[PDB]
Amino acid sequence: EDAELLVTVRGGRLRGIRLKTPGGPVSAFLGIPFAEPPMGPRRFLPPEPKQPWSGVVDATTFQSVCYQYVDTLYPGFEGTEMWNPNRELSEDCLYLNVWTPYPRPTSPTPVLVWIYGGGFYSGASSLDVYDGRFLVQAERTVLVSMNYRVGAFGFLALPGSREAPGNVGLLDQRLALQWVQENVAAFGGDPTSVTLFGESAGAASVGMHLLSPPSRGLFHRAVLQSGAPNGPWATVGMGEARRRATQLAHLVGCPNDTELVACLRTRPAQVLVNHEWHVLPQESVFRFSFVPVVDGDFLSDTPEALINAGDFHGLQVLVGVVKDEGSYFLVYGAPGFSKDNESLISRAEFLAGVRVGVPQVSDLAAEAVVLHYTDWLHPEDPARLREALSDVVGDHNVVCPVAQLAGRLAAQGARVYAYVFEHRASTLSWPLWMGVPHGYEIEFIFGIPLDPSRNYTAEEKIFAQRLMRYWANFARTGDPNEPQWPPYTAGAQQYVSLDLRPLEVRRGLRAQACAFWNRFLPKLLSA
Amino acid sequence: REDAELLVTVRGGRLRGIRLKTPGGPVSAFLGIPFAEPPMGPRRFLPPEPKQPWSGVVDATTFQSVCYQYVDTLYPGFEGTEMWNPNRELSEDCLYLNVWTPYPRPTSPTPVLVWIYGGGFYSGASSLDVYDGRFLVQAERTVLVSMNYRVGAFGFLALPGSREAPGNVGLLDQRLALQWVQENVAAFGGDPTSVTLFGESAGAASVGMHLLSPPSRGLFHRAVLQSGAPNGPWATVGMGEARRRATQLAHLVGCPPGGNDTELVACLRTRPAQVLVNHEWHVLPQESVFRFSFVPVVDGDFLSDTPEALINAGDFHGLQVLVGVVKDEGSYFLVYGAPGFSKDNESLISRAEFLAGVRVGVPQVSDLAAEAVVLHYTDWLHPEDPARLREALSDVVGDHNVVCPVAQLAGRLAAQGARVYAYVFEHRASTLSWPLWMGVPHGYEIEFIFGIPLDPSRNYTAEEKIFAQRLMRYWANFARTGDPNEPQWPPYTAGAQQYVSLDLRPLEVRRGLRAQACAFWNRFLPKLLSA
């Protein structure tokens, strides 16, 4: 046997697998159980630690994906299938994965922990684009990723109730981080150098562990890619969370919270998924049914309030966005949009799209959005309207929440590094009009262009190696440098552009637009 | 004995004029023609009565008195301010007009330009050196008329509903002057069927209110509005606010010692004119710039609705208008109350002074509205740069009070049948005494329209004399034909939004009268104040 693939953790023994990369072998331990399967009576309940096992757990292949909706907008299209589950769906899905150099490190190695995105309703650590083999070989870190419950199974909340308290998907992540603290040294990892990174809802999850004290002691640095806990989509209030959970029960034939949750636990998992989207209050894009709830427990206040009231001295954070955060979501409900044509919409379609992209706001608020995003010298140009409503969705949901997080963190003691990812992949399968869409920096952070079986250019392989160096440098030292990448400050607002060209320093993360979302709109909605 | 060309008979009687020298030749001037009975004593605040006929010959040989008004003392002796102050004695006996005609008098009917001065409805006079009509008449061979109208409380104090002080009598003064033109301008060689109103600031606002009042609409055919509109936030006032200001002015002068309107007005009528003027500014609701105490009141009479509503609902086919602004409409007004501002230093204000100035420049709006102003006019990459903040507050005041009101008027008129031409005046006069940071301030295109640079005693450059002659040609071409052209000046439309720049260079066509900023003032901000 290969002694390098045998590991004993607190719960028992594991057998791993040796993987190949163009730069040499790596050790992988896939499908390690870290929680008891949240089946039957454990549905909706907080996770509990996996009990010890005898024998050797086979950790050579990925485990099941947590039960989730499957996208059917473009069947067979790679641009959407790459995010769909690539393993069997199951509620028995609380497993994590460890990648480590081969042979395993003998001295403590910095740890990167990946939290996937997918709007709190989808995602899996087994997706090809999250393959940790290249980061580990190239930068000699330990990479851990976990699966956490999504959809109703992870975030259905009847606030106050104990049968369905909410946020258990976040607790799945916290349990995995506790598992890392207790077991990563057995793989060569340093439990005192843990860097969280995630994208979208994963980035939102990273930020929520930053604002929940029981999680704060489980890591030391944070990376937030195209997401933040303080957006309009990553949290929901107790009242609306209760309305959605109650509505879901009605749609599946269920009836007192105890009796309500009791009935929901009798339904097949696929039945809950089939009605998940129908509990949203209106037509929308960039909105998801079951998300973290602000109930005073995991989050003792709104993330915005927790960000403004925090002392963040001693914290290093890496945040950033892609060039066109909004484009991807427009084909999921904005009238006039799809991947198949130029999406050259009209004024009427733009105005209708604003109510879809900014749902659940007063008409006056919507008019304010139209004022700020209309070019009143070209109020009806279709190309400008397409770009503008992409800006509306992208700034409202990603860029401006990320800009607000960065500004307040920097102004309250944290050292912040900000980027804008501006390279359109040569292999990109979405249309040109989408630009650099949400989620298409990940494959470069994970070094997927180094895979010889794929068709990335030579330049793109070099660019991926740069990005892996920045990310790993930040994990080791809190700084990606060593042309310089300067810290982001609330005044200078400096960031860098990441593309095939060398680093270029710029000012302002859509500062004009984000003054509207972050400073003026909250005042308007309050009056 | 007598010169037959300086003798004219109008309906009221005979007149005697004078022969004026101009650099281009002689011009006949009939200055100080009475067109109303003096609104003295019992007639204070009352509508004007037509001048009763007279026997003998009235000497119309010099400008008459300036209507009683506040005299500005901000920079005593400074040319930039003294040029707007009265250059004749103050008197309530001030309802006189002036006619300039070519020498010899026209053989055939000649198009008429009628000037309405500005001054915030509280000041002004047709006798100001900058309104001298001799150069226009000589250069372009039109007849030019200008009238005095009552300003301040004497022209616009309103107790709505009462007949002792109904309000808007200053506008009735101009209407009577326009009526006089219809009945008498032919005696000077003028064509009563080709009459073009033009005015600046409150004079431009007055021109617009004649457009929206049917009884005046039949007295002229074309309109020119310079740096002013009837629909701005300063040109009109509501019935209740007009009565509150009128009642408080009376209270401040011992009247009564509110109540019955007749006794209130009769008490006001006993007060010396200067006593009313001394308290005029104290009735304003708050500290502000670009706000004036006694302005036209929307009472359903002269204006059956707000100028906004009358504009949006009006049919303007068959009308030609010429509208425009100068490059820096807001700067002049900042030194009148915005913190940090002076003509004598660079006025490089702080962020705190900028936020304070927003409330002074946009008075009587909710805190949310003020926050919306700060959002649009702040550069969030340079939120505290003093120079940028200075230009920003100038824009706030200029867009809110002039540019966007003019832009809305232009767009609605064009969309509803009118033919409109728009300009932006971009030349800073070589003789300008205001500091450089003010740019091209409000009011300083008038001297070029009137051909003042042709005066030998002044020191404009030769280029400026050509520039003035070209501007006079545009204005007269519009008066004669409804088209300033003959490089072209295209009409203004709500879509293309084309206008020309007026400076020493040839005409350049551009798009949008501050389209982004005025979308905020004209489209969004009203929706916010309604909620």
Ligand SMILES: *[C@@H]1O[C@H](CO[C@@H]2O[C@@H](C)[C@@H](O)[C@@H](O)[C@@H]2O)[C@@H](O[C@@H]2O[C@H](CO)[C@@H](O)[C@H](O)[C@H]2NC(C)=O)[C@H](O)[C@H]1NC(C)=O
């Ligand atoms: C661009 O495409 C959209 C999407 O339409 C779908 O995809 C196209 C490639 C084609 O297969 C269409 O027939 C599909 O419906 C068009 O928006 C739709 O237009 C039709 C009427 O033409 C309407 O019934 C649908 O409801 C529209 N979809 C939405 C979400 O509003 C759009 O018209 C196309 N633009 C063009 C052709 O210029």
Ligand SMILES: *[C@@H]1O[C@H](CO[C@@H]2O[C@@H](C)[C@@H](O)[C@@H](O)[C@@H]2O)[C@@H](O[C@@H]2O[C@H](CO)[C@@H](O)[C@H](O)[C@H]2NC(C)=O)[C@H](O)[C@H]1NC(C)=O
């Ligand atoms: C620019 O000038 C203003 C106006 O102040 C007047 O003009 C100055 C040139 C100088 O002669 C002052 O003494 C005059 O009072 C300055 O603002 C004033 O500042 C003083 C004290 O600092 C204050 O009492 C006044 O209220 C201010 N006036 C207003 C209208 O706010 C301003 O400070 C000058 N800017 C500089 C010097 O940078």
